[PDB]
A paper describes a structure:
The polysaccharides in red algae (Rhodophyta) are primarily mixed galactan agars such as agarose and carrageenan. Carrageenans are high molecular weight polymers having a linear backbone of repeating D-galactopyranose units (G) linked together by alternating α-1,3 and β-1,4 linkages. Furthermore, transcriptomics revealed upregulation of the CarPUL during growth on ι-carrageenan, while biochemical analysis of eight CarPUL-encoded enzymes revealed carrageenan-specific activity, thus associating the CarPUL with the ability of these pseudoalteromonads to liberate energy from carrageenan. Detailed analysis of the enzyme activities encoded by the CarPUL, combined with interpretation of growth phenotypes, have allowed us to propose a refined and detailed model of κ- and ι-carrageenan processing by some Pseudoalteromonas species.
Despite extensive efforts, we were unable to circumvent generation of this inappropriately matured form of the protein. Therefore, to provide insight to the specificity of this enzyme we generated C84A and C84S mutants and attempted to determine structures of this protein in complex with neocarrageenan oligosaccharides and fragments thereof [Supplementary Notes (section 4) and Supplementary Fig. 10a–c]. The complex of S1_NC C84 with ι-NC4 revealed electron density for the substrate that enabled modeling of the non-reducing end disaccharide. The ι-NC2 represented in the model spanned the catalytic machinery while its poise in the active site revealed complete sequestration of the non-reducing end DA2S residue in a deep pocket, showing an obligate exo-mode of activity on carrageenan chain ends. The 2-sulfate of this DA2S unit in the 0 subsite was positioned relative to the S subsite amino acid sidechains in a manner anticipated for catalysis. The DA2S unit in the 0 subsite is complemented by the shape of the active site pocket while excluding solvent and is the only component of the ι-NC2 substrate that makes interactions with residues in the active site pocket of S1_NC. Though we could model the G4S residue of the disaccharide, S1_NC makes no direct or water-mediated interactions with this sugar residue, or with the G4S sulfate ester substituent, indicating a lack of plus ( + ) subsites and that the minimum recognition requirement for S1_NC is a single non-reducing end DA2S residue. Taken together, these results support assignment of S1_NC as an exo-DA2S carrageenan sulfatase that would likely have activity on any form of carrageenan having a non-reducing end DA2S residue (e.g., ι- or α-carrageenan).
Numbering used by the authors:
A (entry chain B): 36 to 507
B (entry chain A): 35 to 507
């Protein structure tokens, strides 16, 4: 029974790291990438926290678990992942793993402890279950101030980017690391197999770091991508609406957007130091050599691509794509360019740990890809499936199917679907849905989506067959 | 022995406009119906939204039982139609030998009246394909952007709020709904079979669009704006702030725009009164009126700037929650009912008139006892109404309100902030007393009445309610 460490980050994009030729120097994450299996085309299940995490830890889609929206926020109906979903946590506990959890759970108060883990520390540890949804009255007042032309300390906008007082050592990140360190030290003192999860608040917006991370990257030198700052042309209505109060960016200057980038870059550099600290402790404790590691972000974050901030009910690559590294110490490093899913994590954990089955696996184990490379999946369609059922009590029922060359997004709460040519338009600027030159590719993607919805027993397949009846 | 039944169903018609309610619009034909029938002066809709209110009206069951708990066919609702397994009063009436005819807005899924055995004579929904793409308001969004840049439409108007239409009464959708109503009554007079007619008027749904002379009949300059007009919402839930539909952004509205919204609305009500007179006169000419069993009702009210709100949204304020209701039974003396009644009470009233067979639960009660006996039918019973706002066009809110003559408690389970209004001292619902310890006793009573109502109708949200209200339990 191998020891397992999961390093799980909140809204960490795929593309920032120096190992991806990104603008931030990340030597410790780069070294883990180069020792392990790089999943360079990993996709999350949903660009939202609780759904992405329920998918990750159960191995089933939201329509099967019931966990299809964030919990505990205006105006979601949900409070917690059902305790009937044990997750990999209860399954690992059942076969003799000591499970430990540090940091943000976001699947209901006390959730890791209720499923048999040592919940060492985190926001969710000692909260009462079934709390009133967190309604963002303070964010609403602050964004009204920004629209009235006000700024916070030093010209900053604290709903987007913020210089924190003190040092790295005073940060929540330093505490997540210190608990990780204690988890590793304690595990080294037991004969018993260990399953450790460290869920970091970083780099969740607003992008908040102390010095020197706050000024490490000069806002004036940021390279803004081709889809930065644009008017959304023929895009669905849900991309326009102010779902969360900070989604009003009408007040944001190019300088505000550059600082969003520069402070995000600071957070990634601060994450790299944190990863280094935990890896080095694991080495000092004689655990690193045999440690089975997953480094993953629950989803990406928008830095003004399509004039969007944070995340919302959409499928653009900057949110849908996730960083993923899985290190099996028995295997030679490889780079997987075939698309993989957040639904593939739990099966990977299942094959490593010999977890008992607790029902369906909607994904597949990544072990064959890790051993054999992209050749494991030769012959097979290269597709990913993404859902955005809900955003914080708004229902959208969104589904996207992504090939290496094309993305089809179904928006059943709109009349307007999306079709992107990822080969000729990788920044997803032009919606080709009504473009007759793309009929053959649309038709192919509609059929692949109907196949995926059937495979996972999505009850929205009926409505899909109605909306897409021009193609069956 | 089985009575002829006519329903006149209006879209977003408020309770308070009519001259019989001492309202600002002269409505002699509705006034005459009110005087010959039973006035339900404290009628409440089930929901301030169209499809849910109409599913409740026609099935007699709450949306958690029918599945019809949001508008159909709109950004970004999940719904397209009432299940065909809900036959409604239409299928029930058909099965016992009623000729059922439907004119105008159904809003419960394309061809719905015809699938349930009605003659769907005319209406938006009559010839549509089922399972259509939701109508996404791209044009209304672009219009409201223009209004935010300080633009106006033709003649200084704002066509998402109020509009002078070209032509005359005779060119209007209302005139067509009336002509089809006239043909329904003419045809019914030729039949041995009992008749169940429904005329569902588009008016007076915003934007408030009428031809002359209705467009200028009421002078915007003379409108009396109520005490809750134009205010900053203090300690109100967040759902009242958000721009759910693009025209809910009223940051651009002048006091004159709001007065014109009133004055054009008043024009629509005067044009509705003419329409009602037309149909009542046809029914008298056809020798149907003397035995005709009639319901006049609006599916809900409409906000004209109370709490700085326009149209409707996920809230429970009286101007939206209250509905006009008149039920005329020709065998009975006129009465005024001040006891609260619900949209859930329509179907049971139809069931007792028509002897419709049971098709499952009735979440309301028949209004025949109140129509015969007056308010004292209910002596020794709590005077309550129950209101839900489960969804607004794909936003989930799960809202529930309990209203007594003196108090309203609104549960907002998608928020941390509930509402509590003293309707005796604050009937404009300006002050949220939820956190006011002087109102602990009234809150406690209303929480228990709500728990009882949720239990009575088997609402699955009762579990969450018990968690949110555990300080009571
Ligand atoms: O409770 S949390 O959602 O974990 O934290 C919130 C809030 O997170 C959100 O931020 C906006 C609003 O909904 C989502 C995002 O669009 C959610 O992010 S997600 O968890 O990554 O899906 C966060 O912005 C604020 O700083 O803290 C609150 C804590 O109540
Ligand atoms: O499809 S309809 O809803 O019958 O008509 C709509 C629109 O009505 C709506 O207007 C806003 C958006 O949702 C509701 C209201 O807040 C809805 O009104 S309701 O049906 O009474 O709940 C209507 O104004 C316009 O004429 O047509 C559109 C599309 O048919
Ligand atoms: Ca996240
Ligand atoms: Ca209506």
């Amino acid at each position: 029974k191998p020891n397992v460490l999961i390093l799980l980050f909140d809204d960490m994009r795929f593309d920032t790291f120096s190992y991806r030729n990104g603008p931030v120097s990340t030597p410790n994450i780069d070294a883990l990438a180069n020792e392990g299996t790089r999943f360079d085309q990993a996709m999350t299940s949903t660009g939202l926290s609780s759904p992405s995490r329920a998918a990750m830890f159960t191995g089933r889609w939201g329509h099967k678990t019931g966990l299809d929206d964030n919990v505990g926020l205006y105006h979601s109906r949900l409070s917690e992942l059902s305790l009937s979903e044990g997750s990999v946590i209860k399954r690992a506990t059942s076969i003799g793993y000591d499970v430990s959890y540090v940091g943000k759970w976001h699947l209901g108060a006390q959730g890791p402890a209720l499923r048999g883990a040592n919940f060492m520390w985190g926001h969710d540890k000692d909260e009462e279950r079934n709390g009133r949804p967190f309604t963002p009255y303070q964010t609403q007042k602050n964004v009204a101030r920004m629209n009235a032309g006000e700024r916070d300390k030093n010209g900053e906008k604290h709903d987007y980017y913020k210089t924190l007082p003190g040092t790295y050592a005073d940060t929540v990140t330093a505490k997540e690391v210190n608990e990780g360190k204690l988890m590793l030290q304690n595990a080294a003192k037991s004969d018993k197999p260990f399953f450790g999860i460290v869920s970091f608040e970083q780099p969740h917006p607003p992008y908040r770091v102390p010095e020197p991370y706050a000024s490490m990257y000069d806002y004036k030198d940021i390279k803004l991508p081709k889809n930065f700052g644009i008017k959304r042309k023929h895009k669905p209505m849900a991309q326009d609406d102010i779902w969360w109060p900070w989604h009003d960016v009408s007040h944001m200057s190019e300088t505000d957007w550059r600082k969003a980038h520069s402070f995000y870059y600071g957070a990634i550099a601060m994450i790299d130091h944190a990863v280094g600290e935990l890896i080095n402790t694991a080495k000092e404790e004689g655990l690193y050599d045999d440690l089975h590691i997953i480094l993953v972000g629950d989803q990406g974050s928008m830095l003004g691509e399509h004039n969007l901030y944070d995340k919302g009910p959409y499928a653009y690559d900057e949110l849908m794509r996730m960083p993923l590294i899985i290190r099996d110490p028995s295997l030679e490093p490889k780079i997987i360019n075939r698309q993989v899913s957040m639904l593939d994590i739990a099966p990977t954990l299942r094959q490593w740990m010999t977890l008992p089955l607790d029902g369906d696996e909607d994904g597949r184990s990544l072990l064959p890809l890790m051993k054999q490379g992209d050749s494991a999946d030769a012959g097979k369609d290269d597709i990913s499936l993404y859902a955005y059922e809900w955003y914080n009590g708004g229902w959208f029922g969104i589904r996207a199917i992504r090939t290496p060359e094309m993305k089809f997004v179904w928006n059943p709460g709109d009349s307007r679907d999306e079709l992107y040519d990822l080969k000729n338009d990788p920044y997803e600027i032009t919606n080709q849905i009504d473009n007759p030159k793309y009929k053959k590719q649309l038709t192919d993607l509609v059929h692949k989506m109907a196949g995926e919805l059937n495979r996972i027993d999505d009850p929205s397949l009926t409505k899909f067959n109605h909306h897409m009846k021009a193609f069956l």
